[PDB]
């Protein structure tokens, strides 16, 4: 509360570390369904069903232009990519399995870097 704070955490490397995690995500061989925004003109139902589309290129653009105020907002956008994937794809599908793999890959890098 006012004048009552936990010891200050060094957050100066957070931007660089999220950038590194994102690069690792982008170069994973199962990243291909998440690299670019889903084409809303060529994929029927996607625009109506998925209220908040998200992809790795949009996260990269947001990160590089100072649009993430903190760690949690970056993590929420990464998780949104995989939550969207789960909403639109059967678990028993290549993209469905890609999403599960990429979420596990992210969460391990997230805990190891910041916990
Ligand atoms: C995360 N990606 C997806 O949910 C979907 S839905 C239809 C697609 C596609 O990604 C690749 C191309 O076509």
Curated annotation (Swiss-Prot):
Residues 9-113 form the Bromo domain. Expressed at varying levels in several tissues, whereas a smaller transcript was expressed specifically in testis. It is found in: Nucleus. Belongs to the WAL family. Component of the BRF-1 ISWI chromatin remodeling complex, at least composed of SMARCA1 and BAZ2B, which regulates the spacing of histone octamers on the DNA template to facilitate access to DNA. Within the BRF-1 ISWI chromatin remodeling complex interacts with SMARCA1; the interaction is direct. Component of the BRF-5 ISWI chromatin remodeling complex, at least composed of SMARCA5/SNF2H and BAZ2B, which regulates the spacing of histone octamers on the DNA template to facilitate access to DNA. Regulatory subunit of the ATP-dependent BRF-1 and BRF-5 ISWI chromatin remodeling complexes, which form ordered nucleosome arrays on chromatin and facilitate access to DNA during DNA-templated processes such as DNA replication, transcription, and repair. Both complexes regulate the spacing of nucleosomes along the chromatin and have the ability to slide mononucleosomes to the center of a DNA template. The BRF-1 ISWI chromatin remodeling complex has a lower ATP hydrolysis rate than the BRF-5 ISWI chromatin remodeling complex. This is Bromodomain adjacent to zinc finger domain protein 2B. The chain holds residues 2054 to 2166 of 2168 of the full protein.
């Amino acid at each position: 509360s006012m004048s009552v704070k936990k010891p200050k955490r060094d957050d100066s490397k957070d931007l660089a570390l999220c950038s590194m995690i994102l690069t690792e995500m982008e170069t994973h061989e199962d990243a291909w369904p998440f690299l670019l925004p889903v084409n809303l003109k060529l994929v029927p139902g996607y625009k109506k069903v998925i209220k908040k589309p998200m992809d790795f290129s949009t996260i990269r653009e947001k990160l590089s232009s100072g649009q993430y105020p903190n760690l949690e907002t970056f993590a929420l956008d990464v998780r949104l990519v995989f939550d969207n994937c789960e909403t639109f794809n059967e678990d028993d599908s290549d993209i469905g399995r890609a999403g599960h793999n990429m979420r596990k890959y992210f969460e391990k890098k997230w805990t190891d870097t910041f916990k």
